[PDB]
């Protein structure tokens, strides 16, 4: 059922995360971490302190799909165990700033063909698939998008619900 997921999402902010390759999403799915550029890092840290849950919805560029969604379990932090992302051309490890710890809620894919009926009012009422990295998604739109994902049998929401 959806009672657990709806509880997690009740007071949530949602952000579209765009990745340049599948490798970084695979790393993030296994280690439960994410890093972003400083402008988005500041936005996510503000959101973490202002909402009961902050949800990141991942899409690899040119893939035509979302690859899953996760909930922030911490603000960004520096000086921890270094994450060996595949750094894009001209980007250094210091430019990515802090590491967010995240708990994945769904690691299964959702093709854009299944979200074509959803528009984001906070992005000029464009289809929810459209947005720059870090684009915030309005609550109702983000909730309905997350509810479209298939159930993930590798996920147990027990830990997320306990840390809320």
Swiss-Prot record:
The chain holds residues 345 to 507 of 727 of the full protein. The gene is YTHDC1. Changing residue 85 to D: Does not affect ability to influence alternative splice site selection. Interacts with SRSF1. Interacts with SRSF2. Interacts with SRSF3. Interacts with SRSF7. Interacts with SRSF10. Interacts with CPSF6. Interacts with KHDRBS1/SAM68. Interacts with TRA2B. Interacts with KHDRBS3. Interacts with EMD. Interacts with RBMX. Interacts with ZCCHC8. The modification Phosphoserine is found at residues 81, 92. Changing residue 132 to A: Reduced binding affinity for N6-methyladenosine (m6A)-containing RNAs by 100-fold. Regulator of alternative splicing that specifically recognizes and binds N6-methyladenosine (m6A)-containing RNAs. M6A is a modification present at internal sites of mRNAs and some non-coding RNAs and plays a role in the efficiency of mRNA splicing, processing and stability. Acts as a key regulator of exon-inclusion or exon-skipping during alternative splicing via interaction with mRNA splicing factors SRSF3 and SRSF10. Changing residue 58 to D: Does not affect ability to influence alternative splice site selection. Changing residue 59 to A: Does not affect ability to influence alternative splice site selection. This is YTH domain-containing protein 1. Tyrosine phosphorylated. RNA binds at residues 18-20, 34-35, 85, 133.
């Amino acid at each position: 059922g959806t009672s657990k997921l709806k509880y997690v999402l009740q007071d949530a902010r949602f952000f579209l995360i765009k990745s340049n390759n599948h490798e970084n999403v695979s790393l993030a799915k296994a280690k439960g971490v994410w890093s972003t550029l400083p402008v988005n890092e500041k936005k996510l840290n503000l959101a973490f302190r202002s909402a009961r849950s902050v949800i990141l919805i991942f899409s690899v560029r040119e893939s035509g799909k979302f690859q899953g969604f996760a909930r922030l379990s911490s603000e960004s932090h520096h000086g921890g165990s270094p994450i060996h992302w595949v750094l894009p051309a001209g980007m250094s490890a210091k430019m990515l700033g802090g590491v967010f710890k995240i708990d994945w809620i769904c690691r299964r894919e959702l093709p854009f063909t299944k979200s074509a009926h959803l528009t984001n009012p906070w992005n000029e009422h464009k289809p929810v698939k459209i947005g720059r990295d870090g684009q915030e998604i309005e609550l109702e739109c983000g909730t309905q998008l997350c509810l479209l994902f298939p159930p993930d049998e590798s996920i147990d929401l027990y830990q997320v619900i306990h840390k809320m």
